């Protein structure tokens, strides 16, 4: 999150997280992010779920294009730069930078 | 014949719609689970 350098939207950077413990309460209760959309699981009660792996795909866009990042949507960025699975189980976080 | 990609070119005076936004998508993969949650505690009484 606090990483200084982010790649382009078409060059979205992917990281793998495993063998650790994740506290999503701090992220959810931060107020510094204007985008908190969790699909598949509730935004809260994430502390009761344990998974094998976590994939973090980070990039930067302009505000007008923050809408297209969601299942079942269409748009320039989604279709040509970063397309996501329709039935993914995860959460998208974003904030003005 | 046109170059496929274009530059946003962000400026300090950007509008709310055109202002830059950082986006991170966290996808959880499960198929032995390795990353678990925090499960709080209390005090002991005897």
């Amino acid at each position: 999150f606090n990483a200084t350098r982010f790649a382009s939207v078409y060059a979205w950077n992917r990281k793998r997280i495993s063998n650790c413990v994740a506290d999503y309460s701090v992220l959810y209760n931060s107020a510094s992010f204007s985008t908190f959309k969790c699909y598949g699981v509730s935004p809260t009660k994430l502390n009761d779920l344990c998974f094998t792996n976590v994939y973090a795909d980070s990039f930067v866009i302009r505000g007008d294009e923050v809408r297209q990042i969601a299942p079942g949507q269409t748009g320039k960025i989604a279709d040509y730069n970063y397309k996501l699975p329709d039935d993914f189980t995860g959460c998208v976080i974003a904030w003005n930078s | 014949c046109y170059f496929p990609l274009q530059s946003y070119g962000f400026q300090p005076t950007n509008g709310v719609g055109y202002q830059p936004y950082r986006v991170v998508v966290l996808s959880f993969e499960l198929l032995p689970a390795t990353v678990c949650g925090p499960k709080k505690s209390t005090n002991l009484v005897k």
Partner: nanobody
Amino acid sequence: QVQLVESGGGSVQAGGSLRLSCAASGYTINTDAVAWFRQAPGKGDERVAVIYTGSGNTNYADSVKGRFTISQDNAKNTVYLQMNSLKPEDTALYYCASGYYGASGYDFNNWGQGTQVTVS
């Protein structure tokens, strides 16, 4: 054809209250949704609250929930933001935006000079 003017800002102590006004002029019938957003110097835009004029549904930023209340007066053609239990984080310029539809943050426009609120 639509104008929004913000007023009611000022300097208050922590825990104080202010009541900010968004007076609309022109043919505002098309704009069903009205939102209040704020910007501090260093930081970017954020929407504190939004309201649907026809339905009455409202949305609030997690930080402001409980302390802020959004209301409208049709006769005044004004949307009001009530700030209670003001906090230093609340300090920034406040403006009201308006749009036909609520899917996106841009369709809101027509926001005025804004009002400064400082909590110290």
